[PDB]
Every structure is written in C-alpha cells, then in structure tokens.
Design a protein around this nucleic acid. Structure first.
Ligand SMILES: Nc1nc2c(ncn2[C@H]2C[C@H](O)[C@@H](COP(=O)(O)OP(=O)(O)OP(=O)(O)O)O2)c(=O)[nH]1
Ligand SMILES: [Ca+2]
Ligand SMILES: [Ca+2]
Ligand SMILES: [Ca+2]
Length: 341
DNA sequence: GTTGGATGGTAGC
DNA sequence: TAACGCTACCATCCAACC
C-alpha cells in the first residue's frame, strides 16, 4: 500500500492571504468574535508570522491583541474556506478516486494503483503541490508512507510547505525510536498512562502483557498500538461518511432563562438542519457549554427520522432537562444530529 | 447471555 | 488573562431483550 496524506498549511489564514495578497509576509490572525464584549472570542488560526509570537488556535482575541496589537485581525469566513477546500479536494480526486477527506483541510489518497514505488510517490506529491499552487495559490504539506498513520507522521515532520517519505526501513526505525506521544491518537492522558507502564516507544508495547496494557489504556488503543508496533496496521482508505453534524453558538451573556436561550438554540438548529443536506438523522443531542466551560449534553434517539419540526420540539425538552438536572448557567448552546438513515 | 442508547472523555488517531 | 468552532471513536453504566 502507498498512502499520500495532504494537509493545507495555516489554512484559513492562508485563504485570506490569497484573497488579499498585501497581507502576505506579516501577521494575520483569523478570529471568531463572540459579541459578549469588545474583542471577546477566540483565534481560529494564525499564520506562521503570528505563531512566532504565541498567537495560535484557541487563545483569546484579547490575549492575541496584547501580544500583536499591529496584526491583521479578520473574522472567520468558514463558508469561503469550505469552498476553497472543496475545490482542492476535487483536484485531489483527479490523482486518485480512493480519497478519504479527514477534515476541512486534509485528505488521504490511496495511490497504490497510480504509482509503483516511493520515488514515483514523491514525484506525484510534488505534482500535487504544484497543481494546488497553480489553481488555488495554496501551499500544502504532503506525507507519504505505507499506511495512514505513518503518512500522517510524515506530514507532521515536514510541515510547513513540506513533502516527506517514510519508507519501510524508516517505519521500522520509528517503531523503535519515535517518542510514543508523537503517535497519532496519543495525547497527554494516554502518554502519561503509558509512562507509568514504562512504554516510551511503540516497540515497548511488544514486551508488556496484553491485559496490563488493556487495563490501563483500554482494548481499542492497545490493539491499535500493538498493530503499529508489529508493522501490521492496515486500515484501508475509505470515502468519508459523516456520522454527526452540529452547530454550537455563543450567547451574548450567560443564562438559565429558557426564553432567553431558545433563540440561540433555534439558530443552531436552523444552521445544523441546513448542513444536513438530504441526510435524515434519527438522533438529536442538545449540547450546552456551562459558565465554567464544562460541556454537558442531553439527547434522544428515535425509531424514525427527525423532521425540522420535531428537532425544535425535542431540543426544547432536552434544554429543559439540562436546566432541571444542572444548576449552572449556560454560556454556549447548540445541537448535534446523528444516526443518519 | 448480548445489544445499543445516554452521557462524557480523549484526541484530533 | 479568557477560553470559538467542529467531529470520530471509545468507555462506562444502565435498561431492554434473549
Ligand atoms: N474555529 C477554529 N478552527 C480551528 C481550530 N483549529 C483548527 N481550526 C480550523 C482552522 C485551521 O486553519 C483548519 C485546519 O486545521 P489545522 O489543525 O490543520 O491547522 P492549520 O492548517 O491552521 O495550521 P497548519 O500549518 O496545519 O499547522 O481548521 C480551532 O481551535 N478553532
Ligand atoms: Ca493544516
Ligand atoms: Ca489539518
Ligand atoms: Ca501527542
């Protein structure tokens, strides 16, 4: 198998640089302004010039402005970015129809039938990079390896504006040498737990009793790590099938008054239901972010599909359930649809 | 004995 | 100092179904 993974560089900020070339080469910070007070909200993403000064995805806009007051601050235009993305995913389909879109800015291509070895895979990667540059003026990072996980690791090593092959021999090397926290699917919590068992590299999973690994990080993560360690991880590339679609919005001010929260909930529903595009969901969850930023939800699965009308009725009840069973004020409110027919 | 819904945790797999 | 937005997959706990 040969997998080619593509991830667009500083995507939203880069799209804004393409739409306004005079922004290029100086700090650009793409923001979601929440309206709670002047400059309330969070950074969605920043370009690399901005990142050098600590302005990155997830920090507050007021914190960013304290560091880079002279940066260019642009509101998030997600619809514009989705259009560029979709045009790029369609360019990627011309190189292989076996495509797994994994996010708004990344995809895995199985090119096993389009190229014969890694040398040709590398040349195709450069071809892909050059094409997206010609058509969309977007730079990307390409990772190439024998499976999805290592193609991902290869891109991570190579970003930004990179291309990198991890061949069979280097996979064997990384199984021994790569820090296990840098393996996709291993964050802070799982890494810490693995340290307590003395597992720092993938290779170390081959030494521990299966039930002890399973007991600490669970069956699925244990199977996954051992499979990578054996070099027998072989998840095929498959067409993305979206499993849930949702929208959460932020309120001008925290509240537990149902009548004040309803307008927001209902906008979340309108936007979410529009995003369904023909899909008919059987489950609905109302999702609230409380005043202390804890996430709570209540949901319901129906034996049949949920109409817009039923979504309205049922979401109000689920919001009432949250209010009755949780003391806290609500900061953000939204909805998630799943279990599509 | 399973199956799967409700809720939440982990990691962007 | 304040913290927006989006989603797949898994774990635990529990009721329903044999
Ligand atoms: N609103 C919001 N959007 C985010 C957040 N994180 C990522 N995104 C969106 C904006 C990014 O441009 C886009 C792609 O995510 P990536 O993780 O690949 O980061 P990005 O491409 O911006 O930087 P890149 O060079 O990979 O490092 O997804 C976030 O915390 N909030
Ligand atoms: Ca990216
Ligand atoms: Ca990405
Ligand atoms: Ca990690």
């Amino acid at each position: 198998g040969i997998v080619l993974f593509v991830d667009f560089d500083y995507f939203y900020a880069q799209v804004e640089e393409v739409l306004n070339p005079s922004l290029k080469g100086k700090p650009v910070v793409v923001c979601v302004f929440s309206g709670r007070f002047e400059d309330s909200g969070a950074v969605a993403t920043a370009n690399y010039e901005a990142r050098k000064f600590g302005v990155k995805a997830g920090i507050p806009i007021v914190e960013a402005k304290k560091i880079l007051p002279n940066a260019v601050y642009l509101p998030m235009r997600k619809e514009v970015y989705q259009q560029v993305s979709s045009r790029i995913m369609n360019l990627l389909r011309e190189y292989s129809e076996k495509i797994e879109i994994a996010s708004i800015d990344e995809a895995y291509l199985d090119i096993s039938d389009k190229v014969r070895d890694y040398r040709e895979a590398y040349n195709l990667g450069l071809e892909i990079k050059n094409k997206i540059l010609e058509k969309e003026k977007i730079t990307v990072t390409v990772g190439i390896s024998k499976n999805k996980v290592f193609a991902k690791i290869a891109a991570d090593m190579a970003k930004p504006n990179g291309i990198k092959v991890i061949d069979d021999e280097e996979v064997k090397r990384l199984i021994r040498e790569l820090d296990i926290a840098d393996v996709p699917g291993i964050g802070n919590i799982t890494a810490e737990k693995l340290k307590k068992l003395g597992i720092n590299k993938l290779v170390d999973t081959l030494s521990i009793e299966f039930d002890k690994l399973k007991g600490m990080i669970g069956e699925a993560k244990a199977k996954y790590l051992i499979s990578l360690a054996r070099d027998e991880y072989n998840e095929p590339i498959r067409t993305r099938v979206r499993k849930s679609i949702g929208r959460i919005v932020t309120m001008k001010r925290n509240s537990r008054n149902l009548e004040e929260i309803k307008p927001y909930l209902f906008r979340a529903i309108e936007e979410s239901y529009y995003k369904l595009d023909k899909r008919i969901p059987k489950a609905i969850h109302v999702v609230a972010v409380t005043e202390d930023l804890d996430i709570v939800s209540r949901g319901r699965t129906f034996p049949h599909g949920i109409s817009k009308e039923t979504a309205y009725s049922e979401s109000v009840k689920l919001l009432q359930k949250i209010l009755e069973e949780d003391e806290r004020k609500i900061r953000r409110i939204g909805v998630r649809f799943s279990k599509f027919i």
